[PDB]
């Protein structure tokens, strides 16, 4: 699959807004994911002990990792499809080390869309959301393909 330049622009336009507060956006997204799909929290030995949203919100480690996740994903989106090099180490660690099934990647993609929709309605209309979805789908497809090669495919 290939996104058009116009679709990439819609993605990068709203992502520019995200970069105005990466830490805050990362917190929102991770907490949305952990509440909507609590099982995902089990993958984090560091965050497993977090019982409530208030605890998640007060966690400095959770916030720091949100910045790390969004910065990594941001670097991928800005590649506009030419993200092979950025995908290699990401797929290896998530397949071999953490063992993250594709299903969970669909879950966070879901969390990303939800948060952008709430915080940036003016820059996330139906067209922008469609473009963001295509970008995240392309990401999941390439990650999945890489998973297979590494002998995983979750």
| Residues engaged in binding ligand HEM (CB under 6 A) | 40, 43-44, 46, 68-69, 72-73, 90, 93-94, 98, 100, 104-105, 108
The closest of 139, 19, 11, 118 to 67, measured between CA atoms, is 19
Nearer to ligand HEM, 6 or 68 (CB): 68
Length of the chain: 154
> How many Cβ atoms from other residues are within 10 Å of residue 45's Cβ?
7
List, in order, residues 6 or more apart from 152 with CB less than 8 Å away. Answer: 95, 96, 99
Query: Rounded to an integer, what distance in angstroms lies between the CA atom of residue 15 and that of residue 118?
Result: 14
Q: Which residue is it, tokens 């071999």? A: 96
DSSP letters, 30-85, are: HHHHHHH-GGGGGG-TTTTT--SHHHHHH-HHHHHHHHHHHHHHHHHHTTTT--HH
Considering beta carbons, is residue 49 or 98 the nearer one to ligand HEM? 98
Query: Which of residues 4 and 68 has its CB atom nearest to ligand HEM in the complex?
Result: 68
**In the complex with ligand HEM, which residue's Cβ is closer, 31 or 73?**
73
Annotated binding residue 83: no
User: Does 94 count as an annotated binding residue?
Assistant: yes
CB of 154 to ligand HEM, least distance (A): 10
Least distance to ligand HEM, CB of residue 139, Å: 7
Count CB neighbours of 126 within 10 A.
7
Shortest distance, position 42 Cβ to ligand HEM, whole Å: 8
Q: How far is the CB of 114 from ligand HEM (least distance, A)?
A: 14
Annotated binding site for O2: 65
């Amino acid at each position: 699959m290939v996104l058009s330049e116009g679709e990439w622009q819609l993605v990068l336009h709203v992502w520019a807004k995200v970069e105005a507060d990466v830490a805050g956006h990362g917190q929102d997204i991770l907490i949305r994911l952990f509440k909507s799909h609590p099982e995902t929290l089990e993958k984090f030995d560091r965050f497993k002990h977090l019982k409530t949203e208030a605890e998640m919100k007060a966690s400095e480690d959770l916030k720091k990792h949100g910045v790390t996740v969004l910065t990594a994903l941001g670097a991928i989106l800005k590649k506009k499809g030419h993200h092979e090099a950025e995908l290699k180490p990401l797929a290896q660690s998530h397949a071999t080390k953490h063992k993250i099934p594709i299903k969970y990647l669909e879950f966070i993609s879901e969390a990303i869309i939800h948060v952008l929709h709430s915080r940036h309605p003016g820059n996330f209309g139906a067209d922008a959301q469609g473009a963001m979805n295509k970008a995240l789908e392309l990401f999941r497809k390439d990650i999945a393909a890489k998973y297979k090669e590494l002998g995983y495919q979750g």
